Design a protein around this nucleic acid. Sequence first.
RNA 1: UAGCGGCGAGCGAACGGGGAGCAGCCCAGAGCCUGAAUCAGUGUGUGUGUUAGUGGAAGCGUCUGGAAAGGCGCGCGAUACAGGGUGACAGCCCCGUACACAAAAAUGCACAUGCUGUGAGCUCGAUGAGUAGGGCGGGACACGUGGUAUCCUGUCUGAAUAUGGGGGGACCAUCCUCCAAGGCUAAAUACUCCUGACUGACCGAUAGUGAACCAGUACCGUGAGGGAAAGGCGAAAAGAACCCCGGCGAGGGGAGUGAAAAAGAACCUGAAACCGUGUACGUAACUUAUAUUCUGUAGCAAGGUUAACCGAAUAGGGGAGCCGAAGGGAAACCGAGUCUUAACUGGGCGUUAAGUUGCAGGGUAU
Lengths: 32, 146
Amino acid sequence: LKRNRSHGFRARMATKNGRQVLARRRALTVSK
Amino acid sequence: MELVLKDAQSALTVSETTFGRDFNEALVHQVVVAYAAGAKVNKKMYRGALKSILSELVRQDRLIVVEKFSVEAPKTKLLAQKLKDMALEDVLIITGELDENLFLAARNLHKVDVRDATGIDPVSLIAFDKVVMTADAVKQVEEMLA
RNA sequence: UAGCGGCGAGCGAACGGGGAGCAGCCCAGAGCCUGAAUCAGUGUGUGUGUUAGUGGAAGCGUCUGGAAAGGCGCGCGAUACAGGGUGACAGCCCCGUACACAAAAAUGCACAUGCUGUGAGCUCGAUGAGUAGGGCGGGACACGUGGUAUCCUGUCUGAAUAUGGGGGGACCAUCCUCCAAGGCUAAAUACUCCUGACUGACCGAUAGUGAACCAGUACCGUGAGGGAAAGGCGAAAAGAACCCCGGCGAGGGGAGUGAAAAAGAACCUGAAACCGUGUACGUAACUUAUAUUCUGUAGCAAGGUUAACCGAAUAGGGGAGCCGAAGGGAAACCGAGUCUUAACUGGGCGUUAAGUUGCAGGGUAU
């Protein structure tokens, strides 16, 4: 639950660092 | 009607309108069903059912009254010996002020329960066929039941 | 309910009563003496927890049985008949149950103690200043900037210090309330990620959280995301020592452990669609609840009922509502009669025609 939200794509999008990490990986860590 | 004590026959006068009235089966059944479901109850009908059940118990000769029922010391052995002398096993002890020794040495008795006048409930009275009631509790129950 | 709504669908008040609590102060400025109230910090004391833990009462015989925890008898314990485990159902076999208790060390809770910080308190000033109000253009509910009625202003103005100024539906006579234009607030009042305990006339592997199982796993998509299937040997593996047939395989067939092997690891119980063996027969899916109404039953009875509240608490205190009473007419007003009418035998409504709360159920829409 916490991983699904805290580490979920929503939380990463809410943070600039999360968006940067997701973009870097696309060029992952949560699978619900 | 004067309750039988078996030792002194010193029972005090009891209002027949309260402890000796007609048994209303429907009211008693309704009250016991409501109590079981809860475990709306109205004061007047509840008191009427209590009076009816008390009248039924006294008219069935299942109620015994003594001057003072208690135990010298808080020991279950003394209570067991007293019950054996009385030659009774399933008895509901009802009194006034909460006895200390008896209440302490009465929990383990599966078939014997002790309660005060304010704590009387239809379930407790119906559960045990025989009731031992303290003499001083007559006025308390009369005022409680109006 | 009043009210609102092309008064159609529908939305939605105030006052008051009774409970937990009910705390008002600070300064805006002067003095008197005065850090003596209260709050935090710091070392100590006492009582209570917690973070590990201690003691803790009572029994056997016979018979049935794989094991007795089944029941038969005679005994005892109990301030402890809450529970769990032991070869089948345990107050007396074990952990525990009531009770008595327990801390070298830390913190939390209450105060006292020496000290450091805000710092008793008494009297007398005193109103929170560009304030109420006004003008141009804007932003919010109707403005779509003026229904502008309310709020704020980019900007120009603007006489009040308990003489005076605010409101009270006009102002007003009676008068009710405060000194606004500076700040604080703690109690009762909701929520539960997660922790301790208590349970449930809760669910039983196709139920229950998606997951009783190494489940947010395999897998499906580059990603968001979606998301499964899968428990049961037994009492102790006591897991079949050991002879032989087989390929030093597997598989089974014997003995043995075993209550049971109809418990043998593809491990409790076993039914059909499915395939054979042996025998006989003829045959070429309107759920919960507010309202409407009805049925039968119980208490009291002109009373029944008390509710959020308190309650050694489902008992009892707490009449505020809650249906009616000797009535009705819109009112006056009269009184068993009354009402527009001079009056209708007009005609309507009444005469002391008793009502209420629960119980189980039937129809309607919401």
